Amino acid sequence: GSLSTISRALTPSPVMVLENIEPEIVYAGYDSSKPDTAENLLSTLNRLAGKQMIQVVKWAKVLPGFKNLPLEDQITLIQYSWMSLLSFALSWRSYKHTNSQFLYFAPDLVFNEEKMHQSAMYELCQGMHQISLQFVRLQLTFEEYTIMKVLLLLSTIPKDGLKSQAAFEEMRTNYIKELRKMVTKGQSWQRFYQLTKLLDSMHDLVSDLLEFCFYTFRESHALKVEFPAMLVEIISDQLPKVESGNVKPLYFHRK
Ligand SMILES: O=C1COc2ccc(/C(Cc3ccccc3)=N/n3cnnc3S)cc2N1
Ligand SMILES: O=C1COc2ccc(C3=Nn4cnnc4S[C@H]3c3ccccc3)cc2N1
Ligand SMILES: [K+]
């Protein structure tokens, strides 16, 4: 049941709320009895991504501030950041559970180098792994991770803007302020800078991952790669928007 009377009386901070609303563990439903072909591994990754995206929507709904954005913008933001959010969480799990030795997609799906090759994504996996290694270098904290994940949700917008741009900017700025406050709680700027540089670098990796995903999607029949309905909707809609130059990454330390 609800314990809202106690929860409200505890007056949780936004960071406490972020910890509270973190999605629980999602299993890939990996079947180790089936061949580790690219078609099977990518289909499994896509199934996992679809399941994670269901949880992303649930999470976003209870994210402080997100309710202030119109429905169209809520959808746009979830759609435009899907790969970023999942990739960032992937590096987090990899860091937390394996000290960034492996790619921890799920408890039942942990990639070593062999799986990276088998998935047809070796080089892109290595790019992902670089983020995981940055988490070790920085000793990223969970608090930092949770705020950064919100910033990723708020990192990619239409070139011509959102329906309610000012409301979006207010929310994004509020989370930037949360990050600043968190890093400060003699190298505060340095930390803020490193974390925000890392956020910027997510755009570099994610745009590659999306191009690859779009290619796989276009070739999905030939490659025998399955996509769940959630991803079909996301990808089919975003694909021409990205390709026409209408998707705008937001950067801290670039134009
Ligand atoms: O990480 C990376 C680096 O860049 C790539 C470029 C092309 C392919 C593929 C493989 C691939 C296999 C299955 C799904 C998606 C890509 N190209 N391709 C095209 N037709 N057969 C093959 S194989 C795979 C990668 N992986
Ligand atoms: O068919 C395809 C090929 O293009 C993709 C690219 C990235 C992912 C991902 N799927 N995914 C599933 N669970 N978390 C994630 S994040 C991300 C990803 C990021 C780095 C390496 C591998 C996959 C999935 C696909 N599906
Ligand atoms: K900028």
CATH of the domain at 81: 1.10.565.10
Amino acid letter for position 34 = K
Domain count for the chain = 1
Q: Residues 85-99, buried b or exposed e (16+ Cβ, 10 A)? A: bbbbbbbbbbbeeee
Give the closest residue (by CA) to ligand 2 atom 2. Answer: 213
Which residue among 43, 121, 206, 211 is best mutated to probe the pocket of ligand 1, counting the most ligand atoms within 8 A of its Cβ?
121
- Domain with 117, as residue range(s), is 1-255
With a 6 Å cutoff on the Cβ, whether 18 touches ligand 2 is no
Q: How far is the CA of 59 from the centre of ligand 2 (A)?
A: 20
Interacting residues of 213 by C-beta distance below 8 A, sequence separation 6+: 83, 235
Q: Which ligand is nearest to the CA of 49?
A: 2
With a 6 Å cutoff on the Cβ, whether 116 touches ligand 1 is no
Q: How far is the CA of 213 from the centre of ligand 2 (A)?
A: 7
Closest CA to 72 of 149, 152, 161, 159: 161
| Residue 158, token pair as written in the block | 């239409």
- By what method was this entry solved? X-ray
Map the chain to HEC letters.
Answer: CCCHHHHHHCCCCHHHHHHHHCCCCCCCCCCCCCCCCHHHHHHHHHHHHHHHHHHHHHHHHCCCCHHHCCHHHHHHHHHHHHHHHHHHHHHHHHHHHHCCCCEEEECCEEECHHHHHHCCCHHHHHHHHHHHHHHHHHCCCHHHHHHHHHHHHCCEEECCCCCCHHHHHHHHHHHHHHHHHHHHCCCHHHHHHHHHHHHHHHHHHHHHHHHHHHHHHHCHHHHCCCCCHHHHHHHHHHHHHHHCCCEEECCCCCC
For tokens 């745009």, name the residue.
207
